[PDB]
Each structure stands twice: as C-alpha cells, then as structure tokens.
Amino acid sequence: KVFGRCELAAAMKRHGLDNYRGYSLGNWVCAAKFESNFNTQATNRNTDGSTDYGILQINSRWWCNDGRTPGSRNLCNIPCSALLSSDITASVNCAKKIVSDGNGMNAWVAWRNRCKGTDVQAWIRGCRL
Ligand SMILES: CC(=O)N[C@@H]1[C@@H](O)[C@H](O[C@@H]2O[C@H](CO)[C@@H](O[C@@H]3O[C@H](CO)[C@@H](O)[C@H](O)[C@H]3NC(C)=O)[C@H](O)[C@H]2NC(C)=O)[C@@H](CO)O[C@H]1O
Ligand SMILES: [Cl-]
Questions:
Q1: Which ligand 1 atom sits closest to the C-alpha of 46?
Q2: Which end of the chain, N or C, is surrounded by fewer C-beta atoms within 10 Å?
Q3: Domain ranges within the chain, ordered by starting residue
Q4: Any bridge partners for residue 52, and if so which?
C-alpha cells in the first residue's frame, strides 16, 4: 500500500505516534516519506546483509526476523514480512520500541539527515487531524 500523506498521518496518530517519546507527528511522517516514500512494501538490502522493511524501513539486524541475517536479533519479536502489511500496526509497535532504545529517532538515517532540525510540521499541513 502506498499511503497518502494525510492518510498516513491519521493512521500514525491513531496508533499513538504523535508526540511518542516527544516526537511530533510531522517527524514520523517525514521519516516515512524519505525512508519508504509511504510504501508499506518497500524493502532495501544493506551492505551488512541485513534488510530494511516497510513504511519505516525497520532493519533485520536488530528488530525483526527474516531468516537470512546471521547473528541478528529480533527485538520486536516479529517476522520482517509483518512490517510490509497494508496495516501499519506492526510497524508502529516496532517503531515505538526502536525510538525508546536510547538514540531516539536518530535510529532512522533518513530522519537524521533529512528531517531533523527542519520544519517537520509542514508534513501534516492541511490534514484533518
Ligand atoms: C529504524 C531502524 O531499523 N534503524 C536501524 C538502527 O536501529 C541500527 O542502529 C543500531 O541500533 C541498535 C539498537 O537500537 C543500537 O544499539 C543500542 O545502542 C545504544 C547506545 O548507542 C544502547 O543504549 C542500547 O542498549 C543498544 N541496544 C541494544 C544493544 O539492543 C546501535 O547503537 C545502533 N548502531 C548504530 C551503528 O547506530 C542501524 C545499524 O544496524 O540500522 C538502522 O537501520
Ligand atoms: Cl539519508
């Protein structure tokens, strides 16, 4: 599923990400835009052999099991394929644990390099929230 911007904003708010760990909704929408272009099916291989999955490009070295990332963890206790669903529940629940793990939203490379320190409020402009 390719979410609309305000569509994804509304789904993220419903699942409790607006101001989760202090990060306003626009941060999460901006992160998803540059991680996945709002595409729940997005996957990308990393040089270390891990893969990033879904709307928030959650990585198989730490967070989910894809059966092909040796010596990895599965800290969200979930198959990585669950992160590709049109329903973002699994991705949001896993994202909550990631952003709680010490480094905040810096865990998302695209957020650090493209959203952090910008006017992220613009990402929810016009949305009926
Ligand atoms: C969205 C996503 O999947 N992002 C991936 C990152 O999560 C990952 O970064 C590494 O994440 C682990 C787990 O959060 C980091 O470990 C934590 O490090 C902090 C100290 O910095 C410590 O407080 C935590 O206890 C520790 N958690 C553990 C050990 O479970 C680790 O620092 C991150 N590594 C780096 C190089 O930033 C990166 C890299 O694999 O991938 C993203 O895609
Ligand atoms: Cl980047």
A1: 43
A2: C
A3: 1-129
A4: 44, 59
